[PDB]
Amino acid sequence: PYLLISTQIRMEVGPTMVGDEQSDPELMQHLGASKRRALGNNFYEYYVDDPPRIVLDKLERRGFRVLSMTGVGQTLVWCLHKE
Amino acid sequence: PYLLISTQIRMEVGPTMVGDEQSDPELMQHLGASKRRALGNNFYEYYVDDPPRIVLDKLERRGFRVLSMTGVGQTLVWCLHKE
Amino acid sequence: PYLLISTQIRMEVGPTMVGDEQSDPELMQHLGASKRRALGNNFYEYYVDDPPRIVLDKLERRGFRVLSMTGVGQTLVWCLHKE
Amino acid sequence: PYLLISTQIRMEVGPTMVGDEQSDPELMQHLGASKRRALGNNFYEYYVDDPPRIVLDKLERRGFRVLSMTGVGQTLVWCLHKE
Amino acid sequence: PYLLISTQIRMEVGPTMVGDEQSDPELMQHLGASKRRALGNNFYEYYVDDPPRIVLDKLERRGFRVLSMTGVGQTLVWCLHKE
Ligand SMILES: N[C@@H](Cc1ccccc1)C(=O)O
Ligand SMILES: N[C@@H](Cc1ccccc1)C(=O)O
Ligand SMILES: N[C@@H](Cc1ccccc1)C(=O)O
Ligand SMILES: N[C@@H](Cc1ccccc1)C(=O)O
Ligand SMILES: N[C@@H](Cc1ccccc1)C(=O)O
Ligand SMILES: [K+]
Ligand SMILES: [K+]
Ligand SMILES: [K+]
Ligand SMILES: [K+]
Ligand SMILES: [K+]
């Protein structure tokens, strides 16, 4: 149902974080996401190389819509929901 | 009827703050929230170990909808409303 | 019709700013607000000791709805509208 | 059809910026706005002394609705859209 | 389709960034956008000289509506969606 995606520093370029370790594996696979650990983090996260505009387009085809977009520090976050 | 939840530094990992001293004890119990008074604070707060995506999903099953999401400092906040 | 409320540093505790000098005196009285002139300011504002979640609940009973919530600096602001 | 208004430092006091060089002159006149090229700026801007709550009320009477409110630096911005 | 546009420092003046390398070439041509690789960037971006209010008006004529507006660092971002 709810989904959070994000990008840092610039909105025109990836990586875009598209999930946490408990994310839907089917949706992560559909987006072409990989599990990667950022340096100075103990847990893996899902990410794609695509900029966020492309991820939003792909999520819409899976029935997700944007409820909110916000900036926090140097991170741009989108909150999406499936009916 | 209104609910404020938040997480700091990273959106994919908890803790997620889910209430203040005057929060609904039953809803706090339903979420599995722990009550605590953080270091140097003169008030209590409820929190869960879950990342905020999981808390948003649980709140929807209780009739809460996301009205807004915003960043402030290093905190990502959601404002929810019950039907 | 429009109303702006805010809180600083933490969302769980007040004070909550609920009005400027030209605010509706009856609504300020209904909320239990007091006037205060902050240090170095040439204007007074209305505030309550309650955390913002409690103010939002009171404002809903007066016909106000949340249109937006945003963070700016260390301030969390809500924009409300009456129909 | 789109309108951007803003205020800095505090939401309770003006000035409120209500337009750029290409704004509707009649709407600027209706709001009682003045032109003022500011220090460190090349462009002109329209502004009023009123706090933003009063400008939002006046804009509603002209058919504008608030679509979004956000913070950026020390600026609080509203994005409005005509019906 | 989703669209992300942005401006920095001041909302009244351009440039307005209107696309990434994979943006719709026809829409970029319609807006009169140019490609520009910023200092020390590994990618190109599309931009126009117009302030964002004018770009929002042009995008509405192409069927785009503003879903959200947010501040992140010194950047004001709009998230748009076509019907
Ligand atoms: N730590 C991130 C901001 C952030 C906070 C909370 C959740 C998500 C992201 C930054 O400085 O860019
Ligand atoms: N103090 C929080 C920001 C904040 C302000 C107001 C209310 C809630 C949170 C931070 O720096 O992360
Ligand atoms: N001055 C406030 C931010 C703010 C800006 C504009 C309007 C309202 C509040 C702070 O630093 O917390
Ligand atoms: N420069 C503004 C922030 C801002 C950025 C982009 C557009 C509008 C305003 C400030 O520091 O308050
Ligand atoms: N780097 C931008 C903020 C930003 C972060 C993420 C995406 C887009 C923009 C700034 O400091 O103004
Ligand atoms: K990025
Ligand atoms: K966290
Ligand atoms: K507070
Ligand atoms: K101000
Ligand atoms: K600009």
Residue numbers in the entry:
A (entry chain C), B (entry chain H), C (entry chain F), D (entry chain J), E (entry chain A): 1 to 83
Sentences from the paper on this structure:
Guanosine triphosphate (GTP) cyclohydrolase I (GCH1) (EC:3.5.4.16) catalyzes the conversion of GTP to dihydroneopterin triphosphate (H2NTP). The effects of GFRP on GCH1 occur via formation of heteromeric protein complexes between GCH1 and GFRP, which are dependent on the intracellular concentrations of the effector molecules phenylalanine or BH4. GCH1−GFRP complexes consist of one GCH1 decamer flanked by two pentameric GFRP complexes.
The X-ray structures of stimulatory and inhibitory rat GCH1−GFRP complexes show that phenylalanine binds to a surface pocket on GFRP close to the protein−protein interaction interface with GCH1, whereas BH4 binds to an allosteric pocket on GCH1 close to the GFRP interface.
